[model samples]
Target: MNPKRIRALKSGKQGDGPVVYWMSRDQRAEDNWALLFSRAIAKEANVPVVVVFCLTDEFLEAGIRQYEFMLKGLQELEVSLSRKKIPSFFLRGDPGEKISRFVKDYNAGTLVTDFSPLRIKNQWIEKVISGISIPFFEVDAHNVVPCWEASQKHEYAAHTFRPKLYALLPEFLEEFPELEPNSVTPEVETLSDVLETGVKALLPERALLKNKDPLFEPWHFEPGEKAAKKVMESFIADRLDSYGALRNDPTKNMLSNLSPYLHFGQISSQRVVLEVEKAESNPGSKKAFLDEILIWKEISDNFCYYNPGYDGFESFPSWAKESLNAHRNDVRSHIYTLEEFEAGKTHDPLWNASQMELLSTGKMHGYTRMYWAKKILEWSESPEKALEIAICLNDRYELDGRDPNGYAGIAWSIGGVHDRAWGEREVTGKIRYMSYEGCKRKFDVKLYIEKYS
Candidate 1:
């Protein structure tokens, strides 16, 4: 890994004990920048590397569904870390309090953690940073290119962001170094004691839909890095050729179905791109998949990193906000309450169908997900209300909800986060518009509705 990937979250004096890689977003053992950094540093100092995961009772709108997916992945991860001679500790409650205390107790020389651009993650880091006095570094383990180094200022749109990321691709996109086993051993008992009942058990106390049919189907998603690789390979072999042609068409299963894994950091987007590059596909097939994961995904992260208002109405581009406000109360073709939207009872079965896909499967197909958000804007009382309802339902249901992709995608559909001004749209205003006809032009709208509904 380039040394530039490591950034100082806090500058201070180093302590005395081993290197601690406090795992946050990126949960895998292999292809992990933070963990690689941990082992490399520990090797130099001849100290053991300790891996920590602090799970909170409530992590944003993450519910039992997201927890179920993450915990299963962690269980698989624990096995990998142990085999690599790394000890993993699972902590409950506020990450700030627990992680800092652990570092203090060990007098950790260097505290390395994965990066997350979300405001809540930053808030937790701030809390932890205040308590720890070590050289705290955050690695851009999530993005192929580090977020800070990607662009210093907010990228206006993909047009503005694409060239920059493309330029830095070679420097940051190199192969990851293997994480070697440490000579120093960690206490096995501590590793075994905490996980199963403590952090692994999902408390349904805070869940929006407790004890219902799970939002995430355990049968559908197999959670592990190995499982993730299988998914990538299958997509490459079976579906990559058709991806460019049919990805936007919902009836065909051309989509990669990797977002849940990506959202939880169980898989590396860099690895996915590399595999795609090596796959036997034409330029269009390769470009389409790469475009979705690399350009669109990173741009969403870029949107969030520079704009704190990423999840808010304020994050919408000025022209979008102005046009939306100018026509805020214009007559609508139809209107629906947030409750109605959640029930998938919208006037359009196509809209309801998209919700059903997310409500039952823990994800909506990428194409429909965009349509889902735009329709919310079309039927809601105001642009602001549309954003709120869209966000709430997404965060509550979809596995990839509360992610920058979701935030930026919704803002694009409803609040025009990365969109250009369209001609006058009634309820949506200048925001890009999608309709049943538009969807039908691309795919079978009725087939899509019946499949999920």
Candidate 2:
């Protein structure tokens, strides 16, 4: 792994005990840079390497469905780590507080964690830094090119960021080195209590909560790396050829449907790209899919990393903010509260169907998501309010919510983040307008609505 992939978060004397990799964002064991880095340092120090995951009682807007999916993946990850002779532990509580205390208790040699651009995860990292005495490092295991390595500042849009990413891809997109099994075993006591309580016991109280009106639904996809690999392979075999033409059609299942796995770090986006390159697929289709995962997806991390207000109204480009503000008092033909949106009670069947997909299946087709968010802006009192409603519902329902991609996507639809100005329209102003008629023109809106309804 390139040294640039790792960033020193804190400096202190290294301990003589185990090297600990605090697995947060990148949950899988293999093809993980942070874990590999931890193993390398541990080897040089002649100490064992261990893995820890701190489970918070609740993550913002994460419901039972999200928890279930993550825990299932993590449960499998623990076994995978053990296969490499690396001990894994689970901590239940506030991650920062628990991780800081755990390292001190175990007399850790050094600490490492995977990177995330989200404010919540960063706060936990900050807390760990302040509390621990051992040297701490963060690796961008989630992106093909490290987020910081890709750019020093927030990219205005993909066009500005694409060239920089393309230049670095050859260096950073190489295959991940295999993680060798550790020979040394740590003398520290194992985590018995958390393991005994099990994955089910760690779920948040809100796990019992469900969408009342439409009713909560089961997961549309399986969890864990094994399942993720199968999904990736099947997509390459079956759907890659037609992705360019059919990706935008909501009624077609032409998408890889890999966002949820990618969001959870259950699978590596780089690994997907590598496999896709080897498979027989249309040149244009391959490029289209690659552009989405490599360029659009990674740029999302860039947005959240440099902009603390990535999810807020203030993060919008000045022109977007100005344009949206000008339409602040535009008359809305329809207005709906957050509750109304959550219940899928909107007048437009298309918008309601999108919400229904999110509510029942934990995903909405990418095309419909744009229309769904735009409707929120059109029906809400203000752009700020519209953003809030869209984010709230999205985070509450979608399996891939609470991710940088979700935040960026919603921002693009509601506040024009990473998007250029469009023809002026009522309520939308310069922000691009998406409508029921537009959706009908693209796909069978009536069929989509009927399916979800």
Candidate 3:
């Protein structure tokens, strides 16, 4: 394990009991640095190891859709851990409180947890640290390059951040070491009991749907490490070659469709990059996909880590703030309320189509996502209101909602983070603008609209 990947959160005496890997963002049993590190520490101390996941119904904007996907993936994860002689426990409540209590109750010698740049996650970490005296460690298991080590400041754009990440890729993008089965086991029940209760806690939200079923029945992307691997394999085998030229064409499903897996940490970015390189694909296409995985994806983490106001207007670059504020009261051709936006009731056919896709599938095409957010800025009462509506709809419905990528992407569209000034406009100011004509020129917009409509 690379020493740089681990950060010691607290310096204290190691406990006498089991080593606990309090799995959070990175929820997989394989290709996980945090879990592997926990085992190594425990083995040296000759103590048993255990894994615990703390669940909360109140995670930002999460509903039955997001919860179901995560719980199903976790269920499979527990089985994989058990097969390796590692006991898994699932506890429901505030993670800050539950994780601290679990560590103390088990008399765990040390604590290892996943690294996240999100504000809510950091708050939880702060709370947990305050309550525990044991040595605590945080592992950057999600990013290929540790978020803090990537850069010390918030990068202005991908162009500026690209070189830094590329220079370090040779060192940080090494293949993941497989986690060995646990030699020492702790006495704990399987996840069946808490899994049932977790699902039951979601019942009220499910009933809120009434006749509308949960998004993505026969889930478009199944949730688990096994399913993630299959999706990666198929993408490399079938879609990698066409990715460069056809990925933007929503009419064609040429994308790897790996965002949900990546967002949940079911698959590691390093693993995906290595597998993609192994395939015989076009050099241009491979480079294009790698840029998305390595640069854009990782920079999202960098953005959230450095900018405390990542999801709001304050995170926008200075020029964007100036540009948007100058045009705040500009006349709009149309405006819609939050209720209108959520129901996909906007008058624009293209915008309505994008929302309909999000509503039905729990995902919107990558290109459409940019256009979707930009349009919100164009039609809403203000840039702040537009951002609020776009994020609300996105986090409420998308399978990969409430992620750093979602926040950063929305910021780019509405508030111009990581983007440059384009031709000046009315409502959008100098922010890069997308329109119905642009969609028609790029693909068969009529066909896409029909499919979702």
Candidate 4:
């Protein structure tokens, strides 16, 4: 692995104690740069490697569905690492504080952690950095091309970021080194509460932690690395050949069901890219699949990494804000409370169907998602409220909510963040707009409503 993947967060000398990897964003045991680098340090230092994960019920607005998927996936991660003789810990309480104590008391040589651009994660990193003294390393294991390396400044749009990524792909896209077996004893002993409740916080009901008949039952997917990889393999065999042609048809299963896996880091984006490259599919299909995997995913990360206001109204482009304000108070076609929106009570059957798909299945198709958010702008009290409602609803239900892609997608739908202004129009003004008629043009809206509603 290229050492360039590692970014040092804090400066300090290496210690004699064991190497520790504080797992956060990237939760897998395999194809992980942070974990790989930690083990490498441990091998040279003649010390054991430890992986610690923090779980809490106090996350922003996540519901039981997200908890169920994350917990199940993490439980599997612990088992996978245990077989390699690398002990894993689940820490509860204020994660930054618990981890500070873990490092100090365990006498860790140096700390290695994964990267995340989310606001909460940013706070956690600051707290951990202020609380600890040893060296800290942050690895961009989530992106095939590291987010920082992708662009030093926030990109204007996909067009600008795509070329940068394409030019650098040859330099950064490489095979991963296997995490070999280790023999050193870990310096820190896991607390008993590791399972009792530490490495985690108070969990939700038992019903929220299973695969069969998930309270959200008829869930079309499973959790864990094994399950995640299975989905990728299946996508390659069954749907990838048609991905470029029928991906926008909500009625067809042509889209790769890989976002939730990528969102949770159950499987690595790099691993997915490697597999897609090897898959025997049509050239256009493979190219289209990789375009989403490489450019689109990383561009979202690029947005979140450099722009602090990534999810808010302030993140909108100047033209978008001007257009939105130009049409403000133009007499909204309808205004709905947060409650009505949550209930999927819109007049448009397509919008309601899109909302129901997210509510019931914890996912939404790409084309419909854009349509769903734009309609919120059309009905909400103001552009600001429209953005808030879209974000709140997304983060609360979708399994992949609270992610950069989701936030950016919503921003694009409502604020035209990555898009240009359209001809002036009522309510939407210069910002791009989508409608039920537009939905009908793309697919059988009636069939979608019947199926989802």
Of candidates 3 and 1, the better by TM-score? 3
What is the C-alpha lDDT profile of model 4 across 68-118, one tens digit per residue? Answer: 678778878878898898988777768788889888888888999998998
Ranking by TM-score: 3, 2, 1, 4
**Residue ranges of candidate 4 with Cα displaced over 4 Å:** 185-215
Better by TM-score, candidate 3 or 2: 3
- Residue 217 in model 1: shift from native, Å? 2.8
Q: Count the backbone clashes (under 3 Å) in each candidate.
A: 0, 0, 1, 4
Error of 3 at 129 (Å): 0.9
Against the reference, the lDDT scores of all candidates come to 0.83, 0.86, 0.86, 0.83
**What TM-score would each prediction reach against the true structure?**
0.94, 0.94, 0.96, 0.93
- Write candidate 2's Cα lDDT for 1-453 as tens digits: 699999999999999999999988888987898989999999999999999988776653466667778877887887888889998888878887899889989999899999999998988987888899999998888999999999999888889999999899889988988999999555622334434444345344332325423255664799998999999988999999999999999999999999888988999898998898788879999999989999999999999999999889999999989888888888889888887888788788888888878877888998888888988989999988988898888887788888999899988998788899999887789989876777778889888989986
Q: Write the per-residue lDDT of candidate 1 for residues 18-123, one digit (tens) a residue.
A: 8999898899987889889988887777778989888775654456667667877888898988898898888877888898888877778899999888998898
Q: Residue 403 in model 1: shift from native, Å?
A: 1.3
All models, RMSD in angstroms: 2.5, 2.7, 1.9, 3.3
